[PDB]
Amino acid sequence: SSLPSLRDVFANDFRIGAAVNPVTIEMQKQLLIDHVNSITAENHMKFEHLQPEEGKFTFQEADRIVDFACSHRMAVRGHTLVWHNQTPDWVFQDGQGHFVSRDVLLERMKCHISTVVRRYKGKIYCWDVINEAVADEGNELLRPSKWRQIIGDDFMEQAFLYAYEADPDALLFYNDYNECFPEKREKIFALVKSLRDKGIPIHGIGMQAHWSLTRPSLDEIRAAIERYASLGVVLHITGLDVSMFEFHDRRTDLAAPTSEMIERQAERYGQIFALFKEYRDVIQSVTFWGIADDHTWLDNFPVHGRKNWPLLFDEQHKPKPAFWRAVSV
Numbered sequence: 001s002s003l004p005s006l007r008d009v010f011a012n013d014f015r016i017g018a019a020v021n022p023v024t025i026e027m028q029k030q031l032l033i034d035h036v037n038s039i040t041a042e043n044h045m046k047f048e049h050l051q052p053e054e055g056k057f058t059f060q061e062a063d064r065i066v067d068f069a070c071s072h073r074m075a076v077r078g079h080t081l082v083w084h085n086q087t088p089d090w091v092f093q094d095g096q097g098h099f100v101s102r103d104v105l106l107e108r109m110k111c112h113i114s115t116v117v118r119r120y121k122g123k124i125y126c127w128d129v130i131n132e133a134v135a136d137e138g139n140e141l142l143r144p145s146k147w148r149q150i151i152g153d154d155f156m157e158q159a160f161l162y163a164y165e166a167d168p169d170a171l172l173f174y175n176d177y178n179e180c181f182p183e184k185r186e187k188i189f190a191l192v193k194s195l196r197d198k199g200i201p202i203h204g205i206g207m208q209a210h211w212s213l214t215r216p217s218l219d220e221i222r223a224a225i226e227r228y229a230s231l232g233v234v235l236h237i238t239g240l241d242v243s244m245f246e247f248h249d250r251r252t253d254l255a256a257p258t259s260e261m262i263e264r265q266a267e268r269y270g271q272i273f274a275l276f277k278e279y280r281d282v283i284q285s286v287t288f289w290g291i292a293d294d295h296t297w298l299d300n301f302p303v304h305g306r307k308n309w310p311l312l313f314d315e316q317h318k319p320k321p322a323f324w325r326a327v328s329v
């Protein structure tokens with residue numbers, strides 16, 4: 001009751017969001033009502049959860065998420081239309097198991113985007129149209145995917161044009177992770193610059209911020225913000241969490257975070273939100289990929305079956321030390 005509300009603390013800076021599903025909306029309902037003014041579907045607006053078979057649309061769970069958000073004056077970010085994961089095999093196949101043509105995959109992509117975006121038009125204000133198309137390793141610009149293989153390299157500009165036609169008032173985003181490592185930052189910058197230089201309706205870059213205690217550095221975060229902001233696009237932080245484990249640290253035995261971990265995490269969140277506040281003119285939304293440590297995808301990624309403690313509230317929904325530093329910047 002005397003705890004500050006995240007969305008009020010940052011009222012003049014950016015919206016505060018959380019990724020949810022209908023279970024976690026129930027299990028974490030009071031945290032959400034007390035703190036966020038933005039909602040993202042953690043899984044139930046991905047292609048496999050909206051059109052699991054061709055012409056079979058399953059909007060029920062996404063509807064419950066949107067209904068919750070509208071009944072509490074929360075905005076909604078749509079996630080996500082075209083992605084190399086969580087997309088059923090039928091999308092790329094014909095009746096005979098072969099791959100479909102460029103023209104056929106384009107009409108399936110258009111129909112999906114059209115049906116999904118039209119249903120939520122006027123309730124969902126922005127869409128992650130393309131998710132994680134840039135390569136995470138190597139020297140090529142683009143990751144391989146059936147979207148890219150079948151259609152060609154312009155599959156992304158098609159996706160953006162189809163979504164703009166379906167809802168020209170939505171802000172359309174390119175969304176990606178490890179967005180602050182310099183070599184991937186430059187690929188993301190080059191890709192988005194080239195699309196905008198063609199007049200493609202891409203309005204925003206989504207910085208997932210699946211970060212650790214050490215990586216990326218505050219200087220890499222600042223440089224990435226300024227690099228993306230220089231394109232004239234809107235910036236959203238879309239999946240923020242702060243893992244207690246570096247990428248090399250695949251330990252399964254840890255039953256509670258050390259007090260060093262907890263303290264470094266608090267400091268890390270303080271520095272991150274100070275940096276965000278400083279760039280309040282280009283960042284308009286900060287969404288955590290969860291809200292409290294009783295639900296996080298990091299419990300099973302990248303290591304199945306361990307436990308992580310990445311968010312501002314603990315498993316009993318009490319503020320962590322990180323909370324106090326985050327709201328005091």
Ligand SMILES: O[C@@H]1[C@@H](O)[C@H](O[C@@H]2CO[C@H](F)[C@H](O)[C@H]2O)OC[C@H]1O
Nearest residue numbers: 042043131177208210238239289297
């Ligand atoms: O439950 C998991 C879900 O949380 C996760 O969502 C992705 C996490 O990394 C980024 F934010 C992606 O763009 C999200 O869609 O991954 C899938 C699911 O198993």
